[PDB]
Amino acid sequence: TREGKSSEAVSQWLTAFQLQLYAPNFISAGYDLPTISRMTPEDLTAIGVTKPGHRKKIAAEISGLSIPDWLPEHKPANLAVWLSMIGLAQYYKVLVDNGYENIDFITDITWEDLQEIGITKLGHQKKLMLAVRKLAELRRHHHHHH
Secondary structure, X not given: OHHHHHHHHHHHHHHOOOOHHHHHHHHHOOOOHHHHOOOOHHXXXXXXXXXXXXXHHHHHHHHOOOOOOOOOOOOOOOHHHHHHHOXXXXXXXXXXXXXXXXXXXXXXXXXXXXXXXXXXXXXXXXXXXXXXXXXXXHHHHOOOOO
């Protein structure tokens, strides 16, 4: 019921500004509030939010979301631990079987790479990619701390 608690929370959020009609769009794509807080308008369009007034309303509400930090702030010890912190433990096997078996390799993965190997849910793709860019920034700053 983590996924159940999460989806209830996505519905209650939408309901409070009367756009609960998109609940299935977000939930079927595996969006949770944390990932939703980082959506762009194109991400809304990709889940079927195409009417400009709805898309702009949602965009305005997302900018107002205040939710606690959830991205890890360090390069974790391994893939398993990293997936577990971000709530995506279920993709471990498919990631490993496809050649993304350690944190270093996962840092270079792209949206297109996910699509190819069967991680097709847009919300999960978004969350993975937000986490991956956090890793890439850590890696990019690592030798530049003086």
